[PDB]
């Protein structure tokens, strides 16, 4: 068969819907900008080949073989490493306080932009402004120090009232206007996983890949907008001092594992919920490359518009947002819409398509934790199915009121550097060691050929045993020695947040020896005899 372009339209656009996330649109432009642009792109293309793609391919192979969720994949592999799945459930609780709040900030801009007069265009004493210059060159205003744009003033005081909180040690009350905005999101999420029928259908077209093809028109505006020739040069600076000892590779380790999928246990249920594809080496290789390609375009439109800020402020590109945290997307897109001619209508379009692109990473993102826990109470879910799906939403809601307060960005950064960085990286290390150093690559190599019939490459077989556990161990060894301290919104850091940071990073690390110590005294025999009886797989 030739398999002409009639399949190519149906296939390639369906890969885009499974690739682009908010980790490719929101996380990646900000993680290039935290450690200096250009210095991140070259460690991005090396860590993805050596550490991202072989772990992206490993979880899809074990999903089609054992046909279970990530809680109960390990019972057919090694029964003492069941706490890895419990480490997935305790990390995914921390993501629901980290990732659902960014959705709550996206729907708030949709409500506050029905007016023909956009609030981003001026700082006209509307809610809380002052020391602001809206017209950069439209009313020949020169730029001075300690000045803020109205695109930043609309964020830093309207939606997230930062000045209410003096720091991380003192948080205010609860904002009534934002807490009712996240309530509408969890209503849609609960009314979407109520049945959960999505394997390969045509809902992937409208939900994800059609908002992406309309998001690419922002790059057309950035070409017309000035400062682009001095803007895109900052993204492509290959020379940087000491990319081996500083510790910017954990910014690459956390970004790749948040964008591709492995680490969060979402791939062990996604490859178990479909059928035998028989093209896993040819589908996941295209998907993992285009996931960096759908993130390269979104990592290119942001620094183009930030060159327009650096041009009319007469400052450096790294001088524009020196201490601005994870809200770089809600400032760059805040200015890039107001400079368009159709600023009123396109603000509704560009933000509503950002909502549907984020919900697909949540409607299918909960598949790694809801489907996986179905294999633990088999005789209970016949009268529990209305309860625990509702119970996990309310539990994640009540765990998210620590960051729906006025000091929101003081908690979102803490759940980014410590809850996503080392915690997902450690679980992905134990997932690779226990499948190769303990379960053995000999049994795993015969399991791939049963579903495919094609032998894995000699370049691939050296990765899961020696190469990929070496890079994951070097980053953790470089993290415990180096101070993880950063700076955010003219606030240095408190010293007690660092000790709090390692407590969150070891909150998932403590669950894995807990289940191993649970298997200590419950088995009889000699101490050397109890171990072999514990690591022996089950019998059907």
């Amino acid at each position, epitope marked *: 068969e030739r398999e002409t372009w009639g399949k190519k339209v149906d296939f390639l656009l369906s890969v885009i819907g499974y690739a682009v996330d908010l980790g490719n649109v929101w996380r990646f432009p900000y993680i290039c900008y935290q450690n200096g642009g250009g210095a991140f792109l070259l460690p991005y293309t090396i860590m993805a080949i050596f550490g991202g793609i072989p772990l992206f391919y490993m979880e899809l192979a074990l999903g089609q073989y054992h046909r279970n969720g990530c809680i109960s994949i390990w019972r057919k592999i090694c029964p003492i490493f069941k706490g890895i799945g419990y480490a997935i459930c305790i990390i995914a609780f921390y993501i629901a306080s980290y990732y659902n709040t960014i959705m709550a900030w996206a729907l708030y801009y949709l409500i506050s932009s029905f007016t023909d*007069q956009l609030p981003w265009t*001026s700082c*006209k*004493n509307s*809610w*809380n*402004t*002052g*020391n*602001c210059t809206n*017209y950069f060159s439209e*009313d020949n205003i020169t730029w001075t120090l300690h000045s803020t744009s109205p695109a930043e003033e609309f964020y830093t*005081r309207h939606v997230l*009232q930062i*000045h*209410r909180s003096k720091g991380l040690q003192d948080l205010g009350g609860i904002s009534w206007q934002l807490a009712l905005c996240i309530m509408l999101i969890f209503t849609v999420i609960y009314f979407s996983i109520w049945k959960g029928v999505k394997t390969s259908g045509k809902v992937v077209w409208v939900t994800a890949t059609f908002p992406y093809i309309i998001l690419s028109v922002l790059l057309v505006r950035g070409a017309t907008l000035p400062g682009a020739w001095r803007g895109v040069l900052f993204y492509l600076k290959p020379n940087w001092q000491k990319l081996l000892e500083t510790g910017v590779w954990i910014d690459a380790a956390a970004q790749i594992f948040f964008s591709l999928g492995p680490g969060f246990g979402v791939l062990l249920a996604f490859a178990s919920y479909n059928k035998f594809n028989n093209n896993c080496y040819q589908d996941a290789l295209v998907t993992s490359v285009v996931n960096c390609m759908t993130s390269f375009v979104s990592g290119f439109v942001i620094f183009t518009v930030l060159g327009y800020m650096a041009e009319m402020r007469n400052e450096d590109v790294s001088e524009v947002a020196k201490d601005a945290g994870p809200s770089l997307l809600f400032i760059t897109y805040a200015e890039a819409i107001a400079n368009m001619p159709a600023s009123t209508f396109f603000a509704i379009i560009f933000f509503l398509m950002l909502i549907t692109l984020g919900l697909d990473s949540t409607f299918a993102g909960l598949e790694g934790v809801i489907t996986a826990v179905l294999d633990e109470f088999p005789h209970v879910w016949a009268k529990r199915r209305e309860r625990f799906v509702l119970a996990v939403v309310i539990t994640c809601f009540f765990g998210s009121l620590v960051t729906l307060t006025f000091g929101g960005a003081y908690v979102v950064k803490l759940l980014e550097e410590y809850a996503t960085g080392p915690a997902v990286l450690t679980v992905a290390l134990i997932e690779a060691v226990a499948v190769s150093w303990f379960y053995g690559i000999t049994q795993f190599c015969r399991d791939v050929k049963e579903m495919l019939g094609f032998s894995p490459g000699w370049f691939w077989r050296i990765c899961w045993v020696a190469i990929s556990p070496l890079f994951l161990l070097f980053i953790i060894c470089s993290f415990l020695m180096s101070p993880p301290q950063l700076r955010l919104f003219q606030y240095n850091y408190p010293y007690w947040s660092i000790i709090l940071g390692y407590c969150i990073g070891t909150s998932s690390f403590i669950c894995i020896p807990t289940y191993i110590a649970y298997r200590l005294i419950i088995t009889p025999g000699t101490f050397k005899e109890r171990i072999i009886k514990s690591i022996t797989p089950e019998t059907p």
Partner: antibody
Amino acid sequence: QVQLQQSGPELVKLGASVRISCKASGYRFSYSWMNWVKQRPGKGLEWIGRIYPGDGDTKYSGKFKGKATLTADKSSSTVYMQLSSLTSEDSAVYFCARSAYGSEGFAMDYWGQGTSVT
Amino acid sequence: DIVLTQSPASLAVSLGQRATISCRASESVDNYGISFLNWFQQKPGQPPKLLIYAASNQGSGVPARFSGSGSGTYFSLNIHPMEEDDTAVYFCQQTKGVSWTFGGGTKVEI
């Protein structure tokens, strides 16, 4: 120290139209609002409207929604208040105050001498 | 058009005593912590002068004889070092939405 002066007193005909000048310099003109305060002799105060320079926005109190007209000019740094449908109650002292620079919205002690019309 | 009434009408002159004036905020709160409220002096014949902005900060050039307090509905005014020169009328203004208005005004005279 921001200089803010006004025009002189003017006479009032029945149902005529007036034009009150409000000159102010030494400050960023298209940065803040401009207040218009009505005060009858003996009575209290009353707010009329506001205007942001650069043809920004005009908000009225409701009593002068079609009776007052505010214009702005970034070149001359002056604003004008065109009144219509004059009566025996409109002849009073009018003020032209500059609003705050931001976070509160107060008056920055930048007031005029009062273009008293009668 | 949120109305506002001042609860006293006129106070006497006695040096070194308490003089407080409250405002009506039956449908009025503050949106961003810094309390949207103003205070103004106005001598007879003189244009109005700022006394206290944001109900807690000292005005520009005004000495420490005047200091405001309160949070929410009823707001205070400390005129405990009462001065003979302060024989004027005082006003109260809202700065929330398009609702800018003034109260009835309270004066002071022996």
